[PDB]
Amino acid sequence: SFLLSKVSFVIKKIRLEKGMTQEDLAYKSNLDRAYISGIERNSRNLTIKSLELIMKGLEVSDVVFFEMLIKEILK
Amino acid sequence: SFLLSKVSFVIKKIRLEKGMTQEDLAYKSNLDRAYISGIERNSRNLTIKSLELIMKGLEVSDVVFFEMLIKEILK
């Protein structure tokens, strides 16, 4: 999946910009660390709900996530 | 969920814009009509891969789907 790879890139990029570890994001979002880790490797076929939870744990607005996704796809 | 109802709304809006029924879309995408139906009710369980595949069947680029999603969130 091209789209799944761009999605995973942005999640990890925003996470690192916010200064959170995968373990911090796990506890925030109530997702397991291993699911987080797989998402960032492009190895979990993430649902929309899971994406919502991650954006919430990352404290990024949904518009900001989608804007950076569009930018990354356009590169 | 606000995000989930906006995602479902946009998939349905575009499918209607392209003049497809739920079944037209399913036949095009090798999915079932009941899956398309459930997605438009409740986008909880939609994955990134399924989303890519739906956009492909709708012949809407990824960048355009995310624009219409942002418009809807902001409206």
Author numbering:
A (entry chain A), B (entry chain B): 3 to 77
Task: Quote the authors verbatim.
The C-protein binds at various sites within the C/R promoter to regulate transcription of its own gene and the associated endonuclease gene. Unusually, in the RM system Esp1396I, the C-protein also represses the MTase (M) gene by binding to the promoter at the transcriptional start site, denoted OM where the C/R genes and the M gene are transcribed convergently from different promoters. Flexibility in this loop is very important for DNA sequence recognition, as it has been observed in the nucleoprotein structures to adopt different conformations depending on which operator site the protein is bound to.
The ΔΔG for R46A is significantly larger (8.5 kJ mol−1), and that for the T36A mutation must be larger still, since we could not measure any DNA binding activity of this mutant protein. Both R46 and T36 of C.Esp1396I are seen in crystal structures of DNA-protein complexes to interact directly with the base pairs involved in sequence recognition, specifically with the G and C bases, respectively, of the C-box recognition sequence GTC. The T36A mutant structure was observed to adopt two loop conformations (I and III) in equal proportions, indicating the conformational flexibility in this region.
